[PDB]
Amino acid sequence: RSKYIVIEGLEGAGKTTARNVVVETLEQLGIRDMVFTREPGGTQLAEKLRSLLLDIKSVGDEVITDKAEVLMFYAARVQLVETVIKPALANGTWVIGDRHDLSTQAYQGGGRGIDQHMLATLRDAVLGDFRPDLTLYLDVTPEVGLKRARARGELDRIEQESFDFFNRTRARYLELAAQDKSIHTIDATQPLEAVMDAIRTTVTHWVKEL
């Protein structure tokens, strides 16, 4: 049975590295057929919304409202999910996504301050029941994430946020992972090999548990 695995974490958490471990582990367990998706993005429309959401001055000097932000993140999500993810899963293909709803909950909920129960409302209103089978949240400290992001190149509109915005975002990520068994928190503040190892076993077990 096809599965939807999502990788989460602050920017500079190591999502790609983690994704590589995941493919390796899965390919090792005999799972080979799979597709990747990233959010916001994944479809023509989703990518348009992505640019509107992250491009510095994507609408000149106008400040995108917090709520417009969540709504755009959501329009992007449902389009990808309905048009790409579900069909894939429905075909038997596994889907590995780089970010999903937890990101909205953490960033818009924790960073932004958008009311937690409203975010839940939207989620169900929009996605209903659909949820990722396994979620890997890579926990890294704000400073280590920003430093890495800063080294990568130019910061998008949201990555230019304050340390406290990232603080609150990380805490919410953790608060929510703490309430959901399918969301595993990997300590990404440890050396690569350790992180890499954590990811491999967590996945290996979860799959074995299937």
From Swiss-Prot:
Signal peptide: none annotated. PROSITE patterns: THYMIDYLATE_KINASE (PS01331). GO terms for biological process: dTDP biosynthetic process; dTTP biosynthetic process; dUDP biosynthetic process; nucleobase-containing small molecule interconversion. The keyword Transferase applies. It catalyses: dTMP + ATP = dTDP + ADP. The lineage of its organism: Bacteria, Pseudomonadati, Pseudomonadota, Gammaproteobacteria, Enterobacterales. HAMAP family: Thymidylate_kinase (MF_00165). This is Thymidylate kinase. The record marks R152 as: Transition state stabilizer. Belongs to the thymidylate kinase family. It comes from Escherichia coli (strain K12).
